[PDB]
Structure formats: C-alpha cells, structure tokens
Ligand binder design. Structure first.
Ligand code: 1MI
Ligand code: CAC
Ligand code: NA
Ligand code: NA
Length: 339
C-alpha cells in the first residue's frame, strides 16, 4: 500500500499525533464513507474519528449555532450543499490551507485555499429497462421533451422538486442557466405530469416498481450504487451537455484538531482516497487520474467529451442561487412549465 500514501508535511502529522481526534459533520452516508474512514485510520491509526452523518441543512444550522454559541464544533465539514458550504467558507468559517494533493485542481474546483471539491457527480437519466430499452432513451433535453409527448409516458416521469430539495434546486437551476433546451423539457414535464421528489430514494423506488419509467436529474453516484443490486435500473448520460455537482470539504477555522482535518482533507483529495471512493462507494471522483466507472475519464467518454460537462463551481458565483429575485425568476418559470 505504501507507495500511494497522501503527500504530508511531517510537522502536520506530528501535530495530528498530539491532537489524536477528528470531528466530521458530513452529508455522505456513513455506509458509503466507511471504506474511506477505515483506510484513512490504517494510514493514521492514532486518529479517533467522530463521523456525524447529517442532513445538509442540519450541518449548516448545527455548525452556525456551535460557532456563535462559542462551543467545540466539527474539525471538518463535508457536504453536497454547495451554496451553503461556499457561503460558510466565504464568511470567515474556513481555515485557509493549501492542500498538497490539490496542486492540479482546476480553479473552479477550489475556493482558493478555503474549500475544495471532492467529487464530480453528473446529473443523469435513470430508467427501468423493463419499460424503456436503452436504444429508445434520448440523451438530450430536446429528445426527452419529444419522448414525454407520448401518452405511454404520462405519469411515468420523476424529477426533483426544486422547492422541497436544495440539491434538486441547485441541479435544475444549473440546467436552466446553462441549456436553453431545459425550458422545452420543463414544459414536457408539465405535459407528461412529472411527479416531483424531494429525495433520490423516493424517486428511485417509483422507477424500480415501474410506477415511473424515467427519472431526470438524479446523480450518477446514487444510480451506480442502486444498479450494483438492481440490474433493471439503466443510466443514460446527456450528450447535449451534463451538469455536475461537487461535494465541498473545508476545515473549520476554529477546528480543535485542525492538523487531523488537514490529514483527512489531503486523504479525500489524494488518488488513494479518490480511487477508493470511486471503487467502493461508486461516488464519482473529482481527480482526473482515477480509473473506473465513477470517474471523470468515464463521464467525459459517456457524454462525448470534457467540453460537454459543466461543473457547478466551488465559487462564490453560485451564491446567485440564494438571491430572492434570481430564485423568483427560475421558480416562476418552473412552476408554470411543470403544473
Ligand atoms: O491512474 C492511477 C491508477 C489508479 C487510479 O484509480 C488505478 O490503477
Ligand atoms: C439528498 As438525497 C441522495 O436523499 O436526494
Ligand atoms: Na481557485
Ligand atoms: Na435519498
């Protein structure tokens, strides 16, 4: 295993030795993170890890309370709620730390030294293969809008409820902002009487039963994980352009064991951690050198080139999504199109 240790500062490792501890608040399901925890501990067996697996709004609320109340909170925050992470990291909550594992991160995958992408997870199409074969599932917004004119598809579509899901909002908003054809598709959800879900599970359970045949906008990581045990679940990658979310990690400014947090963050971003995350958890890796299905190379091949993937950036530019006029405009269009 030794040749693939993450790059480390000896001073850090010796600090992290003295602390012994590492408080994670994370939106990654433990049973998906476990393999990374276990393998992180094998590299630094002198760090006792508190994985708190929490809802995204729970992490944001909890932290903001503990930090205001002046109490010991997390050492490290890891969340798919990109706008809430970037908000915390651009309001004084983050420890500035230049990760030696992030030297080749694109600028839009890090908030300078304040926060880092750990994943590159595409919004995909999923479909029950018993009801829609691969060859008739469109890979474009314009083709999907056409399929959803069919009376056989009425009531047979799931997508996000952007009014009940923060991640659903982020991904449909990014779609709306980047692809004019999303407006034709949103109208076609109205035509097909799309059902809107606040969770991936709720959606996927209705695709697997066949109560739906097709779900739009859910992430490739959850699909691949569910497909490991449901061979009737198909995945189609959009070839007219794909939006990708990035789980954001940052170190608490006021972390009590900051040096641990550095040794965990560097491990998450390393090829060892990214490899194990892609291979075990089926979470789509950020690092471009990972080999396997849940990886940038595989995504880029599936969509017809890297220039077809729009990564939602680890950038304060995404805080436009929190602007009440900018939400108003998108949600006005959405509710009219889908109802
Ligand atoms: O490109 C680095 C090789 C690793 C990454 O997953 C697999 O053999
Ligand atoms: C945040 As989810 C994977 O339950 O839609
Ligand atoms: Na940057
Ligand atoms: Na879910």
């Amino acid at each position: 295993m030794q040749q693939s240790r993450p790059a480390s500062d000896p001073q850090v490792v010796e600090a992290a030795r003295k602390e012994g501890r590492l408080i994670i608040y994370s939106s990654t399901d433990q049973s998906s993170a476990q393999a990374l925890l276990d393998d992180f501990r094998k590299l630094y067996p002198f760090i006792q890890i508190e994985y708190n697996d929490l809802g995204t709004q729970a992490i944001y609320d909890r932290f903001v309370s503990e930090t205001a109340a002046g109490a010991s909170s997390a050492d490290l925050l890891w969340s798919s709620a990109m706008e809430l992470q970037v908000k915390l990291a651009s309001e004084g909550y983050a420890l500035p730390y230049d990760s030696p594992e992030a030297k080749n991160w694109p600028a839009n995958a890090r908030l300078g030294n304040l926060a880092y992408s750990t994943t590159l997870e595409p919004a995909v199409v999923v479909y029950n293969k018993r009801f829609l074969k691969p060859e008739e599932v469109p890979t474009t917004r314009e083709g999907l809008a056409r399929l959803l004119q069919e009376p056989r598809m009425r009531g047979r579509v799931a997508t996000w409820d952007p009014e009940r899901s923060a991640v659903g909002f982020t991904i449909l908003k990014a779609d709306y902002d980047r692809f004019p054809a999303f407006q034709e598709l949103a109208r076609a959800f109205g035509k097909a009487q799309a059902a809107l879900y606040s969770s991936t599970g709720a959606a996927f359970e209705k695709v697997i039963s066949g109560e739906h045949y097709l779900a739009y906008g859910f992430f490739g990581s959850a699909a691949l994980l569910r497909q490991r045990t449901v061979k009737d679940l198909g995945i189609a990658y959009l070839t007219d352009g794909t939006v990708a979310i990035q789980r954001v990690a940052f170190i608490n400014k006021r972390a009590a064991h900051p040096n641990a947090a550095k040794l965990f963050l560097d491990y998450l971003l390393s090829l060892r951690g990214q490899n194990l995350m892609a291979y075990t958890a089926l979470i789509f890796a950020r690092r471009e050198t990972v080999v396997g299905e849940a990886t940038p190379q595989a995504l880029y091949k599936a969509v017809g080139g890297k220039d077809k993937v729009y990564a939602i950036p680890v950038s304060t530019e995404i805080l436009k999504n929190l602007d009440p006029a900018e939400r108003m405009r998108f949600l006005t269009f959405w509710r009219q199109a889908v109802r």
